[PDB]
């Protein structure tokens, strides 16, 4: 059924849209109405790659600090990390370096990483300029895009994107 | 053809609530070995 | 005002949820494993 | 939470003895005849009242093949109540009842709520064992015992609010003192 398996979570401040942007990936909808997480949800694609099927268990993560226990256990094992946040709201962007600490805190040394600024259809209350999320994205050396769930913008990209850098940095091993 | 669409709804509804369930033991159980 | 879902859409989310818990079982299920229950 | 009690409920027994059946009947009260073996383990939930108060069941289906021996035996711990399956056309299964009683001995709880089911009580050309058999066996246990059938839908509901009562009323006695 699969060739490959690989770990992935999404993290983030609540309400940046992580959900969104799997519910995107995973069933090609969106849907405005705020439901905010209970602790974690999950969800299954598979992809190709190289003509090998590619399993994604993707682990969507609640953001908010009251579910932090339970969030935070499961990053040991993941293999790929969204770390995400919202362009209309600045101290979500704040946020992102913390949430590398705690990746950098739990996860593996070599886990694969991307920073996402969702919500980039909104561009009239747009907080944080795509020059200041790549600058940071480049103070981390890791992988920046832009993305929207609701007009479906970069969100195939970033899960194949991540997928590819995983499965290359497997590749290598062999 | 013999599924039916009020049967169908029923069965996403149960297995949302086993999901739900299921995915609170998971999150218990990685607490509970994470000590 | 709002639409019925099909239940070709209805088909399809019970096998997304039935694969979805299949793997949530077997992750139950080495967990406990791992805790020597 | 919608609920007022929560039981862990078990299904264990032979393979092939209508466990996942029984269970079938229990949930969604129906019967197919085409076996797919459990892979390890099978859930479902079903809420139910007694009393007038709402009981949730979470019930797990477990393999009976000795190759999921140990992943099944990791849910016995916790359960407050389990069903010990065998099927009344196939004597082995009924054999290795006792055998099935020594595992829920070592593993669950001392007081677990336990029920032996004497399955596919609807093949009665095929019986291999009498139904005063099934009821001694119980017996010599201490334990209670029903003749049930997924298919006819016989006794598959009073088995599960049995042992739901049985537990109801072993955690309100303990709570009055
Ligand atoms: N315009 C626009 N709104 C979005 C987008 N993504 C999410 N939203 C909105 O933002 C709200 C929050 O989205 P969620 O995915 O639930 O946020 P979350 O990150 O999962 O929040 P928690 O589960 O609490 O951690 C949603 O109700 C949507 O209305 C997007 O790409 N564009
Ligand atoms: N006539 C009749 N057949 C039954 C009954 N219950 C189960 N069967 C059949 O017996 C076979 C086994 O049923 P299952 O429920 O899959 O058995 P199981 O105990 O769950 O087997 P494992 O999952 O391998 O442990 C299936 O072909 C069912 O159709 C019953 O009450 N009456
Ligand atoms: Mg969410
Ligand atoms: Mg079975």
Known sequence: ?174 | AEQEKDQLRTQVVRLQAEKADLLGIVSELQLKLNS
């Open chain 1, 1 to 174: 059924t699969y060739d490959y398996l690989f770990k992935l979570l999404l993290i983030g401040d609540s309400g940046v849209g992580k959900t969104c942007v799997l519910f995107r990936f995973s069933e090609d909808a969106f849907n405005s109405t705020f439901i905010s997480t209970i602790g974690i949800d999950f969800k299954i694609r598979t992809i190709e790659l190289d003509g090998k099927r590619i399993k994604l268990q993707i682990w969507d993560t609640a953001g908010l600090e009251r579910f932090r226990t339970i969030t935070t256990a499961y990053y040991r094992g993941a293999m790929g990390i969204m770390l995400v946040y919202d362009i209309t709201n600045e101290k979500s962007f704040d946020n992102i370096r913390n949430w590398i600490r705690n990746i950098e805190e739990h996860a593996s040394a070599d886990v694969e990483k991307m920073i996402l600024g969702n919500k980039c259809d909104v561009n009239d209350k747009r907080q944080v300029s795509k020059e200041r999320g790549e600058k940071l994205a480049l103070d981390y050396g890791i992988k920046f895009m832009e993305t929207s769930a609701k007009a479906n913008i970069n969100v195939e990209n970033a899960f194949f994107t991540l997928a590819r850098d995983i499965k290359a940095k497997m590749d290598k091993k062999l």
